[PDB]
Amino acid sequence: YTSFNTVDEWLEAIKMGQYKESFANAGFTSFDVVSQMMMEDILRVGVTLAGHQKKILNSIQVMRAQMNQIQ
């Protein structure tokens, strides 16, 4: 899940490291907030490629659902 003490690691794990710069500079610096990100947020941090938006959004959805189990 959390094999990443950090958001940069996670983005790296899902091969989306190219966005760390974007994510950081937008305040999405923890999994707490990241896991609440919606498509809108993904667009704002500037993710414009359809495949990336998806890969990311879907990872976030797994992240969020998992966090929710361990409330």
Structure-solving method: X-ray
**DSSP string across 4-48:** -SSHHHHHHHTT-GGGHHHHHTTT--SHHHHTT--HHHHHHTT--
Helix, coil or strand: residue 63: helix
Which residues touch 28 (CB under 8 Å, ≥6 apart)? 7, 34, 37, 41, 45
Which residues touch 18 (CB under 8 Å, ≥6 apart)? none
Tokens 């959004």 found at:
57
The class of domain 1-71 in CATH terms is: mainly alpha
The amino acid that residue 52 corresponds to is H
Classify each residue of 44-65 as buried b or exposed e, where b means 16 or more C-beta atoms within 10 Å of its C-beta: ebebeeeebeeebeebbeebee
First to last CA, the chain: 15
